[PDB]
Symmetry: D2
Subunit: 386 residues, 4 copies
């Protein structure tokens, strides 16, 4: 009736994987497959998150708007502006060590920033930023899930972003879209962003939906962003459109019915900053990106021993010495693996210095909350990671 | 104030990718990176979808239940049973050629099946199956998105599954969870399934939510499935729990409050079939899997020229000759690439023989609908793919 | 005048090799680069040397010739016949373990053979064979120096071959030509032999010069052998010509002046044996090659524990199980490396069981002489290598 | 009796090589395996030969000695000095294109030099140098046969070196020893030289034998050179000893019987030049090596279009731009392969511009003789290779 077996037995009745194939078929026995330093950029991922604050003026602008509709327009413009720096940025930020931290104080911009690499398996980065004029709280946690297949590498920054406007007693939450790096095998590396972003005003019911459109057939929808701002009863109040690599516009639904085409009567929500001319000769950094890993004058007395400005492999790549930056990275990672074994032979879990596990008080999703008192600078009992 | 440049220029001011690194650093210039045949299994992905019909008795059982609650219990058991065959199945089914088809008629099981490889970039497989006693319609489309990173390969079978119970004038829709293949680099290849499945009864409002739990820390939640069946007003009517590698149980919410632990008063929704003893020596096939690629007596007169039973590379691997199966696969793929160029130089799009693009009439999601009249067997104007 | 420096410093002022390039540029860190078992053949190199005895009838023929001229004709035919088995033999014999031995007794052919793997760094194989009728002694040592570049792999069997004709009180010495394996990268693997061989009769002054011609432009000289036999005063007495893959002819210098063209009046010195029809399905073995690794009935009681008939990885490949033959080879080599470390931590040199270092008593070249008393079979104090 | 077959058929009855294994087992299909530019040095092999003239003062010294014994002492010192520059030189000179040339005129040293890359398959470099005071002719041809196995790469500079002392009407011929580059896989790259060199005075019968000793067990014979100068009747007249990385001494055989130990009464034949302090930061070049690829002021009017000072890939590496030097090398080689195809489709052989095939008039060995009239600079009808 129906056959019960295959004509011949399996060609190889052995447990075979990649490492087994390389050992038996070719002569290569492998001991480690890691990320070569060439694909990196002189930048910690903790500092990559700090680039969200480049457009902090949109938070200042949202904090001084009277009504919730105009605040969401600036909150949506800020969330879109946070991903704009990825354009032509094909270098991968360094995977930060467990216990790594980064602080940034900018009096001229009205915020102080603190981030900590809170986990390694999986890599989790918790960040907190508060306004220096009692205006906003900006915090969250990022698990960057990298996925690769074909010609492209997807990077999904999983985690909840939280923006708390103090002077209005409200909070916004959303998630960043997926970043895609094409032509990683052959061709010119180029960046794309797609996904759906939903910003929720947790005391007014306002919700802003943003569709980062993937480039369709032949790429006619490249970088296009289209969305809307609805109220609590799903009534659309505002139409949003543009490109995250250029500008973001807004218009009322009445005029909506009546190479970004710009409808008359629309108002600008955000426009991308022009990059400095030395950007391409600088890993495509922005002006705000170069200031991130700068060791300020007299900063040796205030920084904790876990600030990535002290990290040598990033500093070595920044100075152009790949030879020792590759060896320092290998030295730092072996020390991190070595420190893990000792923490396992004594059955002791790793302690986070500045953030603690908890639930986001607006969505219930597990999050990494800021514990406070980082800037009183009690920097004993810190990890020795460098 | 803040520095405006990096101390040294970029180490390499050249557009570098993987192919460039291999060419300049090592001596290897590459022309093609494809999937080696060793990781494959003597099975088309069109036939991999046909394994959903192994537990068609659960559809027969659901079709003869009077009330919608008991039908959803068998529909949920059927959807869970469709993924059960993945256990210890670490071989990859062949990527079917554009225009490839597969039919399966089983009078003893009460269904006839037809699938067609409707696209190649991206790979899309449309399938349709109807009951031989005017009882059920089972169709859908699958885009298997493979994603790899670290030690594991994720496979997300994107697409909407549709089950139409004719004698009850209702339809169910859901999506299959993500399959994960661990230890693809080194170690023992093993399978896991996680995600959230939602089955929707489109005329009663009944919704069954199923959580394929990922194995947590140390793997205490391995293969566990937990869910519930709620009515139109989100009132939970039934509690579901078990393992997709063993059995699936059900219980009412009253007794719920009052190594699968089995609560007294629960009833079995589904139990996995035992595999034949020659399974491990058979690419871990089930009894239903071996019958898929069998060329029946006299089948040469009814099959179309695009049925994967006629496909030579699968047949060569099935007979144990990797040498010609690898060459036949390379021959078939070059012919498919060659056929694409001619279709491009004449500016002619590819025509699908048995399925057509459309919208699913229950969710509005773009789908691939069955056009009918496959089994009248008018097999001229078919593609020449072998 | 003349510049004293280069315009720019070195691109990389680091000590870089192959292992460093793979680690820094690609993600691969290597721990071992060895010979994959696919290129091997079910045959120890100790048994590869035993194939010299396939044409022992030419030694029997030389031993029963009255005059030294006709004996050199058969000694030259024997030396040429020893390399004839390489034709279409592109599999590499197993690198024998330190202390490995191989014996072959053939009463029907009139010789008993013994070989021992006397060194590993470098690999040296010493062999001795004596006639069972007090007629000849045949011994020597082989260091196979493998050299690779481009498309081909050269194999130079360094070492002095010694043939002692007892009933004539004379000895012959010579060296085998270089074997070349073409198209090891891409194309069809094929064998070639080139070099100059000089056979010296140590009590008559007779010298036979043989030129294994390399295939010239377009390969018109493929496999051609041309030489002569001169007396003590360099007077040429005999002309030799033919192909080592077919036949070897001889003619006097008078008729020489007056697709092997065969001059009338020439006489055949040697003709190659026809291979059995199952040769190509047998790693291109000869009939004499298959009998080498055969475990005779009752041979378990006479063999030493170091005879490669007991070697499991060769036996596993011979039975068609590459899976365990590759693992047994890896197991045997680790044990050999492990045994070397213990011999180093106790500052003890390795002892050879059956051969001892010495000088060849006919050329003064360092050689490996046979110590005798192998066939009294005192097989305690043998190495444990398997 | 003796078995006639193997228990199981061959594991793979397919023609398999390296390229086939990589394609079937791994996913890599290769199209070209070449030498990566990292292992190179800013230096053509034609210029590598010119470094023989660094110690031309030893030829001047030999030309002004009255007796043949003292001339051979300086000829032997010159031949040893020609290989001394290899110490710590682990970079490979560029493989020169077919038709490439290099000239060097040094009035202050008393010679003009000309070399031409006379072949490509195999690579052959013919060089000629004559004294500017009618004193010496120095010419020859070099086929550098590179052979690799294990941890080391051997380089045998095959070819006959010829030194003609005009004012004494005699000629010397010899061959350079084999160069070995250890630890090319892992470890520190270091250089060794071994072999036997025989210098023959073709009108006096004087012969100087030089043994470049390979480093023995633990390397106690590293770089040691030991030899002697015998007359026509093999009577040893002079004893030579030292290291080719330091100094070379000489002593009469009487005092010979009666960390280089220096016997009292010995006289210095040659001492190595000290390298400039910037040598290690200069690919370990000597002072004479940097002047080789220098484009002199006004040299644009006298050089032929085939002088490697005009070669761009060497110039690009010399300026520190590996990016375009690798692309220029790939561009130059494709043009050379392209030029070969056209020369084949018209059935036209390649013409050598300045050297012609012939026999060395002192040994009869096939050589490449200098045709003269290079320095009349009739540089039309030259190849277009750049
Ligand atoms: C343009 C980019 C292509 C190269 C991909 C770049 C590959 C990544 C390169 C990594 C560096 C060196 C590789 C060394 C690793 C050895 C493993 C080789 C695996 C293979 O390498 O990796 C893939 C791309 O997926 C990757 O990520 C695979 C990542 C796997 C990493 C190791 C994991 C184990 C290997 C396989 C996993 C087995 C588990 C699967 C089980 C799942 C079900 C249970 C080949 O792709 P695929 O299977 O989809 O093959 C198409 C197809 O053959 C089609 O038919 C097109 O045909 P068509 O368009 O001509 O019509 C083609 O097009 P094309 O190559 O001409 O461009 C081409 O795309
Ligand atoms: C157990 C499996 C590990 C091997 C991964 C297996 C890798 C796949 C093997 C393919 C076959 C041969 C590879 C040939 C291809 C050459 C490219 C090499 C890329 C690399 O190979 O691929 C990865 C795994 O992601 C892969 O898929 C990468 C796929 C990329 C394919 C080619 C695409 C271009 C290459 C990079 C893309 C650059 C674009 C990125 C841009 C994104 C932002 C804009 C290394 O991983 P990673 O970056 O996360 O490195 C950790 C880390 O170093 C950690 O620190 C742990 O440290 P720790 O646990 O010791 O604490 C470690 O652990 P471990 O290795 O000891 O196990 C280890 O996991
Ligand atoms: C047909 C076979 C070619 C492939 C060789 C096959 C290479 C072996 C394959 C091994 C498996 C995978 C390789 C992975 C190892 C990475 C190292 C890559 C080194 C390279 O791979 O290895 C060679 C062949 O020498 C080998 O053995 C090298 C063995 C080295 C092994 C590792 C040792 C370190 C690497 C270099 C040593 C550096 C030390 C040198 C110092 C000496 C002086 C002090 C390329 O050859 P080469 O330098 O002579 O390059 C010509 C040339 O470029 C010409 O110009 C023709 O040009 P043309 O005829 O077109 O006119 C071309 O012809 P073609 O390739 O089109 O056929 C082609 O032959
Ligand atoms: C230190 C350097 C070792 C790595 C060699 C470096 C290898 C070159 C690396 C190239 C770059 C990447 C390789 C990719 C190419 C794939 C082919 C792999 C072939 C293999 O790779 O290449 C060799 C070294 O010969 C090479 O040149 C081979 C060049 C071949 C190139 C491609 C040609 C086809 C491949 C094989 C040719 C088949 C034809 C043979 C036929 C001849 C007879 C008719 C392994 O050596 P081998 O056979 O002698 O193996 C010993 C042994 O296993 C011993 O037993 C020691 O044992 P023990 O000392 O522990 O006692 C060990 O010692 P160790 O490795 O621990 O150091 C170790 O040396």
């Amino acid at each position: 009736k129906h056959r019960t077996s295959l004509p011949a037995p399996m060609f190889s009745r052995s447990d075979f994987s990649v490492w087994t194939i390389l050992k038996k078929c070719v002569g290569l026995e492998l001991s480690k497959i890691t990320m070569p330093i060439a694909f990196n950029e002189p930048l910690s991922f903790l500092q990559r998150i700090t680039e969200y604050m480049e457009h902090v003026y949109l938070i200042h602008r949202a904090s001084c708007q009277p009504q919730p509709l105009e605040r969401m327009q600036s909150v949506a413009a800020f969330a879109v502006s946070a991903v704009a720096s990825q354009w032509e940025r094909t270098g991968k930020p360094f995977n930060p060590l467990l216990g790594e931290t980064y602080e940034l104080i900018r009096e001229d911009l009205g915020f102080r920033f603190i981030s900590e690499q809170v986990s390694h398996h999986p890599p989790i980065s918790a960040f907190h930023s508060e306004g220096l004029n009692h205006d906003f709280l900006f915090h969250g946690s990022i698990y960057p899930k990298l996925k690769f297949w074909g010609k492209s590498v997807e990077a999904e920054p999983r985690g909840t972003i939280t923006l708390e406007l103090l002077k209005h007693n409200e909070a916004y939450t959303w998630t960043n879209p997926t970043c895609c790096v094409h032509n990683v095998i052959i061709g010119k590396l180029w960046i794309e962003q797609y996904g759906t972003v939903e910003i929720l005003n947790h005391r007014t019911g306002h919700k802003c939906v943003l569709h980062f459109k993937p480039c369709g057939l032949f790429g006619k929808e490249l970088h296009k962003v289209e969305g809307h701002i609805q109220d609590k009863n799903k009534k659309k109040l505002f139409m949003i459109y543009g490109k995250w690599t250029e500008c973001l516009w807004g218009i009322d639904p009445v005029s909506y019915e009546s190479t970004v085409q710009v409808i008359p009567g629309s108002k600008l929500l955000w426009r991308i900053n022009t990059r400095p001319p030395n950007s391409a000769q600088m890993y495509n950094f922005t002006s705000f990106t170069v200031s991130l890993n700068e060791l300020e004058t007299g900063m040796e007395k205030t920084l904790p021993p876990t600030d990535c400005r002290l990290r040598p492999d990033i500093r070595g790549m920044e100075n152009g010495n790949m030879d020792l930056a590759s060896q320092e990275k290998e030295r730092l990672e072996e020390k991190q693996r070595e420190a893990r074994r000792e923490r396992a032979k004594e059955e002791a879990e790793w302690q986070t210095r500045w953030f603690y596990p908890g639930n986001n008080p607006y969505t219930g999703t597990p999050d990494w909350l800021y514990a406070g008192d980082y800037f009183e600078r009690n920097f004993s009992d810190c990890p020795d990671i460098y």
